Design a protein around this ligand. Structure first.
Ligand SMILES: *[C@@H]1O[C@H](CO)[C@@H](O[C@@H]2O[C@H](CO)[C@@H](O)[C@H](O)[C@H]2NC(C)=O)[C@H](O)[C@H]1NC(C)=O
Ligand SMILES: *[C@@H]1O[C@H](CO)[C@@H](O[C@@H]2O[C@H](CO)[C@@H](O)[C@H](O)[C@H]2NC(C)=O)[C@H](O)[C@H]1NC(C)=O
Ligand SMILES: *[C@@H]1O[C@H](CO)[C@@H](O[C@@H]2O[C@H](CO)[C@@H](O)[C@H](O)[C@H]2NC(C)=O)[C@H](O)[C@H]1NC(C)=O
Ligand SMILES: *[C@@H]1O[C@H](CO)[C@@H](O[C@@H]2O[C@H](CO)[C@@H](O)[C@H](O)[C@H]2NC(C)=O)[C@H](O)[C@H]1NC(C)=O
Ligand SMILES: *[C@@H]1O[C@H](CO)[C@@H](O)[C@H](O)[C@H]1NC(C)=O
Ligand SMILES: *[C@@H]1O[C@H](CO)[C@@H](O)[C@H](O)[C@H]1NC(C)=O
Ligand SMILES: *[C@@H]1O[C@H](CO)[C@@H](O)[C@H](O)[C@H]1NC(C)=O
Ligand SMILES: *[C@@H]1O[C@H](CO)[C@@H](O)[C@H](O)[C@H]1NC(C)=O
Ligand SMILES: *[C@@H]1O[C@H](CO)[C@@H](O)[C@H](O)[C@H]1NC(C)=O
Ligand SMILES: *[C@@H]1O[C@H](CO)[C@@H](O)[C@H](O)[C@H]1NC(C)=O
Ligand SMILES: *[C@@H]1O[C@H](CO)[C@@H](O)[C@H](O)[C@H]1NC(C)=O
Ligand SMILES: *[C@@H]1O[C@H](CO)[C@@H](O)[C@H](O)[C@H]1NC(C)=O
Ligand SMILES: *[C@@H]1O[C@H](CO)[C@@H](O)[C@H](O)[C@H]1NC(C)=O
Ligand SMILES: *[C@@H]1O[C@H](CO)[C@@H](O)[C@H](O)[C@H]1NC(C)=O
Ligand SMILES: *[C@@H]1O[C@H](CO)[C@@H](O)[C@H](O)[C@H]1NC(C)=O
Ligand SMILES: *[C@@H]1O[C@H](CO)[C@@H](O)[C@H](O)[C@H]1NC(C)=O
Ligand SMILES: *[C@@H]1O[C@H](CO)[C@@H](O)[C@H](O)[C@H]1NC(C)=O
Ligand SMILES: *[C@@H]1O[C@H](CO)[C@@H](O)[C@H](O)[C@H]1NC(C)=O
Lengths: 937, 168, 49, 49, 49
């Protein structure tokens, strides 16, 4: 029987108070939605630690036994709650087969949750009522025992047993420092996204949270298959041996020397190495090896060693005191000994080559038997590095002679020369190798890898996610394989749509109707065509006036960082070391100061286009045009209704913020002056003096400026004013409804906030130091050692400031370019009438109005856009008396029976007369010319 | 990487709809067949093929959101608009206009009265057609004609090669 | 720098291709009439008439 | 600047110390001076833009 | 301030007043019109607990 642990098993990881913060930590916690065994007595595994919980009415469970045997022999931990107190002991207890001295510690003090983990700590929580819910357990008991726990028993009501794992959690601390929520970073790809972004809320989009890497499954070790071995058999299995006074010396060289035979063989009476370990002889390599071979008496075999004295050690065969080599010996009583005595062996500086013979006989005692002794005195003599079989077409950890790495081995088409063992790619990268045993060339393909991106709708809509594995296939990792990578969890849809969350290579994803994540080739827009012919023209018959909003950043937060306080905050010892870097600290201060100044210049260049402050009159008669939602509200900061909407939608370490020179009210006064100018004097206030003009007349010029004759304005003035007024109301609804409307200003705020937050977080880094805290270094170490630890923090923190400043300067260049564009736009779009297509939004630009905004400027662009059109028959010219007549302005049109001349941007047919057309050339010249009659007044 | 897709969209995705040209190429004598997509092939123009054919550890490369075919569709749409609806598809609806009349506007727009275009239309169309052929010869012959794009590629390649070589 | 180039290219397409620029030497030498965009590796190529 | 070195002058380090230590003192100057050039170049490239 | 013959002819006491602080910060005996950041005001501890 098992149950779902849900979100239980969280506890306070330490004894530090935190509040109003999302804190990332890794510890032994119960994994979320893990399997816990349901009991309702046995000895269970402890593993890394145990999550224990129970639900009781009669309080049957009283305690636990923890240990390795739970049966005397060693210490066991006994924790029992009985009557009015709790008794904890760690004695060598003899327990019953069915429970329910030498003591080092003893202490005496419904849903119950416990954490038992390793010294040993106990965390717990008690609440009224395995139920679903969340709370965090707190430490109560610290038992500094040092006791080994591998198994435990519960002493008796239902209980649950789970196991803790070393996984990362994002813990949410509320205002009172209570953990109220948590994210298990190993639970799923959405949890990974939440941990990566350090948030419990995830915005719609694609995020890279991890990296996919194929791991090796086995290792491959290859060396040449022992082409040359040394004749150890001619030394140890020799037919005859020499005396100790005058012994044989055979040279061992130019080979693979296998010492496992000599070491493992049981034929030897002794095997001892002095300078090296006897079991490392096959890993080692010696410049030269020499075998000193002789026969001596058993009792005297003990003299064949460094630091010895005696008949052999002093007069026959002496070894160095710093001798490196191995002494190997065995009895030869059935080989060299003779019944009448073998007297062919005679005895008397290191290795330096009167005498008496040894009476070696087969009937003597062991100490009197002959022993064959070989001393191997210790580049050309190397051990048999062992090889393994080679496995192809898999990710492996390989070792080819001296070259190692991880990759996939496949057959190559590379023609290596007879002497070439390894190959390289252009950037000095191993591309292929020759196998040292078999003359074949294998390519090494790096094991598949790439970033892992989570594709998600916002968590306000759905917790379903899809995962894209970048630049990999769908074998290594409802699966869609595309050029960008392997996309798992998204459905493949034939229908294209507008792109929402991009994948790459033409692919986008969305959450659609019941609803699921889909992937598709993106649409670039509706398919259409122009009904082109040599004699057909489309001319607009109606139009609308639309208003669009263009949002541009102008300035950055004027941050300023005191480089000394940041690196060496109130520390004399650190400052003295910081000064060894000369001006590096000063350069950082100068760079940030320069930017802060630039940000005021940006604001001034964009908004101060006018040297006078203009204001509108109490008279609002602008010909039916309602500007009250863009004009300042006189009852309030003196800002417009739209300006308030724009502002309301954007949000001790030496880091400070300086105020702008121009405050929100001052900017409001500039946008007010520019707006009052735009409305009452058109662009004349821009060129020079503000010259009053009736608004309807001003618009007449604005319309003529786009190829629409002024009479259109006056005849349709009520329509135009009504369309304008409606469009402004639409702007307010858009800005009010979604904050995403001002993402461009919010993005600047977010990047600057991230840059500052990163800079602060870096203070907690060690950078190789014993402590991230300067005061903790100074309180622990004297200057001769403290200075080293401080220099490590200075390098890291100084480097951090340099990184921060570089990023601020590059970002500032972007903002300055935007400010320059915004200034250009205000002069050409607000203080004039731009003719630049799509400069002031879509359509034929008429006029625009500036609005103030946090960290930037917002423009409302008023443009003329054709709304309705008709298909007319046309001609480049008409024939009257044979002469060719061309329009002075506009084009010729035909309604099927009569020809008219009219302006291109608005259908308004006129009778063709000598006052509308001019004559040049004739009907035998102009291509497409048609017959007509021109009226002569 | 995100910024680079933004650059691509700001430059090419300037038209709301994807417009195609008609089966008739009677554009007043102006020959655009070498700048229009080749319907028999990657749907790119003859000049576009010339332009493309002249430009050549933990490190990976991501694809662009808009592939060569997506860009080709946008240049095709923008071109179809430019040829058959002039400047009006930019401002709003893609209104049809005869090409000769579109040019008449373009000539008046530089201070040259439109009658000049019509009287010399054959000459003007011939000069245009010749000039396009010259563009093809220039691009085919001189690889350095697109040196700016090759230079950007070379600088990025050098930056990556430097980064990898530093590992040694 | 590439971003600035892209912004210039975008400006040119809007004013040179979609419209008719009156900016001298903005769309090449001479009095600008019309232009046509062409695709290219990592960029845009304009033919200015 | 010393940058942690016993002396700001390279010739002084070489005249006073043998390589086993002189190289350490020099490496400290190299890191600081290389870092100074990297800072200078970055500022020149941004200013140049 | 060292003159052409290496004689000290003038000096700024960097702790004398706020103008002297500006002169030392800018490494000059002349200060141009404007606002300059020269220091950081800090309240000092008076007790040891
Ligand atoms: C300009 O438009 C505003 C609305 O944006 C008009 O103000 C509204 O007038 C109606 C009728 O009196 C009131 O019920 C609303 O509560 C008013 N709204 C606000 C925000 O005050 C204003 O009257 C219009 N002015 C002109 C001259 O047309
Ligand atoms: C083309 O326009 C002309 C001029 O408006 C139209 O001719 C007029 O039609 C009205 C009836 O709607 C008569 O009362 C006028 O006397 C006509 N004027 C002339 C000069 O004939 C003509 O019908 C329109 N043709 C088409 C196909 O719409
Ligand atoms: C406009 O109408 C006139 C007729 O009034 C056309 O001139 C005639 O063209 C035909 C065909 O070439 C000749 O056979 C006649 O002899 C011409 N008549 C005269 C009086 O010259 C003229 O071609 C027509 N033009 C257009 C553009 O339609
Ligand atoms: C545009 O010009 C091209 C030539 O550059 C014309 O294509 C040629 O057409 C002739 C037939 O008249 C063929 O024999 C050639 O082999 C074609 N050459 C190429 C390169 O295609 C094209 O027909 C012209 N189009 C228009 C509308 O005038
Ligand atoms: C627990 O394991 C069983 C299989 O023995 C499985 O069916 C069940 O879904 C698992 N429960 C959880 C919460 O993992
Ligand atoms: C709990 O059991 C222990 C056993 O050693 C005993 O000494 C202790 O007095 C008991 N507690 C109470 C409150 O009786
Ligand atoms: C306790 O320690 C003594 C040695 O001092 C040992 O002889 C005895 O056996 C130990 N107790 C147990 C239960 O083994
Ligand atoms: C704990 O006991 C186990 C045997 O059950 C043993 O393998 C492990 O090494 C021991 N650990 C310690 C720290 O003594
Ligand atoms: C903090 O404790 C107070 C007093 O019990 C309570 O009113 C308040 O709501 C608590 N705050 C949070 C975030 O739970
Ligand atoms: C290894 O053995 C194979 C025969 O199985 C032989 O062909 C090859 O040459 C040997 N390689 C070496 C380095 O001795
Ligand atoms: C000596 O001969 C025996 C029997 O063939 C063999 O097992 C042993 O390995 C040989 N010793 C050496 C050093 O080769
Ligand atoms: C998003 O979720 C919050 C609750 O956390 C809710 O109050 C808000 O209205 C939701 N927004 C939308 C657009 O559904
Ligand atoms: C690798 O991806 C390609 C598609 O680009 C596919 O055809 C091929 O079969 C994949 N490889 C494997 C082993 O499936
Ligand atoms: C698209 O439609 C074709 C049939 O024309 C079908 O074979 C294919 O599986 C469909 N693909 C998707 C993603 O629906
Ligand atoms: C344009 O359409 C509107 C309806 O939205 C209509 O009221 C207006 O009179 C029309 N104007 C012209 C000139 O057709
Ligand atoms: C012009 O004619 C074409 C082809 O019949 C048609 O598709 C288009 O909608 C017509 N335009 C208008 C304004 O009626
Ligand atoms: C216009 O096109 C039609 C259809 O191809 C053709 O009959 C007519 O002659 C053309 N007009 C001119 C002036 O070429
Ligand atoms: C340097 O000394 C010379 C006399 O040898 C004198 O004429 C000159 O003015 C002095 N310069 C300065 C700066 O004191």
């Amino acid at each position: 029987a098992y149950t779902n642990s849900f979100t239980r098993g969280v506890y306070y990881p330490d004894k530090v108070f935190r509040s109003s913060v999302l804190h990332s930590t890794q510890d032994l916690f119960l994994p979320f939605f893990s399997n816990v065994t349901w009991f309702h007595n046995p000895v269970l595994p402890f593993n890394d630690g145990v999550y224990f919980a129970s639900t009781e009415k009669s309080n049957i469970i009283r305690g636990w036994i923890f240990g390795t045997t739970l049966d005397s022999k060693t210490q066991s931990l006994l924790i029992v709650n009985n009557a009015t107190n709790v008794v904890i002991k760690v004695c060598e207890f003899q327990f019953c087969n069915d429970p329910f001295n030498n003591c080092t510690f003893e202490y005496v003090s419904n849903l119950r949750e416990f954490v038992f983990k390793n010294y040993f700590k106990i965390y717990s929580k008690h609440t009224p009522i395995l139920p679903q819910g969340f709370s965090a357990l707190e430490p109560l008991v610290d038992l500094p025992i040092g006791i080994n726990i591998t198994r435990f028993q519960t002493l008796l009501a239902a209980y649950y047993v789970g196991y803790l794992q070393p996984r990362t959690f994002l813990l949410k601390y509320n205002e009172n420092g209570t953990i109220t929520d948590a994210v298990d970073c190993a639970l799923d790809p959405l949890s990974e996204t939440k941990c990566t972004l350090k948030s419990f809320t995830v915005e719609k989009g694609i995020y890279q949270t991890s990296n996919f890497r194929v791991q090796p499954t086995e290792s491959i070790v290859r060396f040449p298959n022992i082409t040359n071995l040394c004749p150890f058999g001619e030394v140890f299995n020799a037919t005859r041996f020499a005396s100790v006074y005058a012994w044989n010396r055979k040279r061992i060289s130019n080979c693979v020397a296998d010492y496992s035979v000599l070491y493992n063989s049981a034929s030897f009476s002794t095997f001892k190495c002095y300078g090296v370990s006897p079991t490392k002889l096959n890993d080692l390599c010696f410049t030269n090896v020499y075998a000193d071979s002789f026969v001596i008496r058993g009792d005297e075999v003990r003299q064949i060693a460094p630091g010895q004295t005696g008949k052999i050690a002093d007069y026959n065969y002496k070894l160095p005191d710093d001798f490196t080599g191995c002494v190997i010996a065995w009895n030869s009583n059935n080989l060299d000994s003779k019944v009448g005595g073998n007297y062919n062996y005679l005895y008397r500086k290191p290795f330096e080559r009167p005498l008496q013979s040894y009476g070696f006989q087969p009937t003597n005692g062991v100490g009197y038997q002959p022993y064959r002794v070989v001393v191997l005195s210790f580049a050309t003599v190397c051990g048999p590095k062992k090889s393994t079989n080679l496995v192809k077409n898999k990710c492996v950890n390989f070792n080819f002679n001296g070259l190692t790495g991880t990759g996939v081995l496949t057959e190559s088409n590379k023609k290596f020369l007879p002497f070439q063992q390894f190959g390289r790619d252009i950037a000095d990268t191993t591309d292929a190798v020759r196998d040292p045993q078999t003359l074949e060339i294998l390519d090494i393909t790096p094991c598949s890898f790439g970033g892992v991106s989570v594709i998600t709708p916002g968590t306000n809509t759905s917790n379903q996610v899809a995962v894209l594995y970048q630049d990999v296939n769908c074998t290594e990792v409802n699966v869609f394989q595309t050029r960008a990578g392997c996309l798992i969890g998204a459905e493949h849809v034939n229908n294209s749509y507008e792109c929402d969350i991009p994948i790459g290579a033409g692919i986008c994803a969305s959450y659609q109707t019941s609803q699921s994540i889909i992937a598709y080739t993106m649409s670039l827009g509706a398919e259409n065509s122009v009904a082109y012919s040599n004699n057909s023209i489309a001319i607009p018959t109606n139009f609308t006036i639309s208003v669009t909003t263009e949002i541009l950043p102008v300035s950055m937060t004027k941050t300023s960082v005191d480089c000394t306080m940041y690196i060496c905050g109130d520390s004399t010892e650190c400052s003295n070391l910081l000064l060894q870097y000369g001006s590096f600290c000063t350069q950082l201060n100068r760079a940030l100061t320069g930017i802060a100044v630039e940000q005021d210049k940006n604001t001034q260049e964009v908004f101060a286009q006018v040297k006078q402050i203009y204001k509108t009159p109490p008279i609002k008669d602008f010909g039916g045009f309602n500007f009250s939602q863009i004009l300042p509200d006189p009852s309030k900061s003196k800002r417009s209704f739209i300006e308030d909407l724009l502002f309301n939608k954007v949000t001790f370490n030496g880091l400070t913020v300086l105020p702008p020179l121009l405050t929100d009210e001052m900017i409001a006064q500039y946008t007010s002056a520019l707006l009052a100018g735009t409305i009452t004097s058109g662009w004349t206030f821009g060129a020079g003096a503000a010259l009053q003009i009736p608004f309807a007349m001003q618009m007449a010029y604005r319309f003529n400026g786009i190829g629409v004759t002024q009479n259109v304005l006056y005849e349709n003035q009520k329509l135009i004013a009504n369309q304008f007024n409606s469009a402004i109301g639409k702007i307010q609804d858009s800005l009010s409804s979604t904050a995403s409307a001002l993402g461009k200003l919010q993005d600047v705020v977010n990047q600057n906030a991230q840059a500052l937050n990163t800079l602060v977080k870096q203070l907690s880094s060690n950078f190789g130091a014993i402590s991230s805290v300067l005061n903790d270094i100074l309180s622990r170490l004297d200057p001769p050692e403290a200075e080293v630890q401080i220099d490590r923090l200075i390098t890291g923190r100084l480097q951090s400031l340099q990184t921060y400043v570089t990023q601020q300067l590059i970002r500032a260049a972007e903002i300055r370019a935007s400010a320059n564009l915004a200034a250009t736009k205000m002069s050409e779009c607000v203080l004039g009438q731009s003719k630049r297509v799509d400069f002031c939004g879509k359509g034929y630009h008429l006029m625009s109005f500036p609005q103030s905004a946090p960290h930037g400027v917002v423009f409302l662009h008023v443009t003329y856009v054709p709304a309705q059109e008709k298909n007319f028959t046309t001609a480049p010219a008409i024939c009257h008396d044979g002469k060719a007549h061309f329009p002075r302005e506009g084009v010729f049109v035909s309604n099927g029976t009569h020809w008219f001349v009219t302006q291109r941007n608005f259908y308004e047919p006129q009778i063709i007369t000598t006052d509308n057309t001019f004559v040049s050339g004739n009907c035998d010249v102009v291509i497409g010319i048609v017959n007509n009659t021109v009226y002569d007044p």
